[PDB]
Design a protein around this ligand. Structure first.
Ligand code: HEM
Ligand SMILES: O=Nc1ccccc1
Ligand SMILES: O=Nc1ccccc1
Ligand SMILES: O=Nc1ccccc1
Ligand SMILES: O=Nc1ccccc1
Ligand SMILES: O=Nc1ccccc1
Length: 152
């Protein structure tokens, strides 16, 4: 678990994220797709995207980023009391989309990177620590659902 002080930084930061949800979502998906191009054959709608320029011009990628970060926001705002919100998403990713948990690790890293890159010298050391714990908490509760389903 995180402290109250820690939860407060996380939710402070997410409020800022929410001011520019599309632009944050776009950058997080582009970071993932470019650093780990195999994530991209999970997506028929995205397989044509052969360049960074094409990824950035794509309205549908923006729309997708908005869906993703909005779902992550709902979870985060539960301050660790997220069983009902986390459950369906763990179940769909393991069962239908078949996403290894290592891609959840990659996207967590993508978020911390994008935060510094969009707000250079505005993303405090205390802020990075709280967010990182928030993201690890999330990943940890996912791993428990993944073990339950024997997903490798
Ligand atoms: C922060 C972690 C993530 C969150 C909050 C999230 C959120 C979502 C949401 C809300 C949906 C739509 C409803 C559903 O199918 O459950 C979705 C669908 C999907 N996700 Fe994720 N996702 C995450 C990570 C990932 C990653 C890392 C991948 C692949 C590398 C992935 C692949 C997919 C696929 C293939 C779909 C189906 C797309 C569709 O219905 O068009 N997800 N995700
Ligand atoms: O729909 N879930 C996704 C999460 C991150 C990247 C692409 C899709
Ligand atoms: O930011 N939300 C979006 C919704 C539809 C298309 C593109 C972006
Ligand atoms: O744009 N349609 C979507 C459906 C499910 C997840 C993300 C996007
Ligand atoms: O690692 N699989 C996931 C579980 C829940 C939401 C997104 C991804
Ligand atoms: O059965 N698969 C597992 C998934 C996550 C953690 C441990 C086991």
């Amino acid at each position: 678990g995180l402290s109250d002080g820690e939860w407060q930084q996380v939710l402070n930061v997410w409020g800022k994220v929410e001011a520019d949800i599309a632009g944050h979502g776009q950058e997080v998906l582009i970071r993932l797709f470019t650093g780990h191009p195999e994530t991209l054959e999970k997506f028929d709608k995205f397989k044509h995207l052969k360049t960074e320029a094409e990824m950035k011009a794509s309205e549908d990628l923006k729309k997708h980023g908005t869906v993703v970060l909005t779902a992550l926001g709902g979870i985060l705002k539960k301050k660790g009391h997220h069983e009902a919100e986390l459950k369906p998403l763990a179940q769909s990713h393991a069962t239908k989309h078949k996403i290894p948990i290592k891609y959840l690790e990659f996207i967590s890293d993508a978020i911390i990177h994008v935060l510094h890159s969009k707000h250079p010298g505005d993303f405090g050391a205390d802020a990075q620590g709280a967010m990182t714990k928030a993201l690890e908490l999330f990943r940890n509760d996912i791993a428990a659902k993944y073990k339950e389903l024997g997903f490798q």
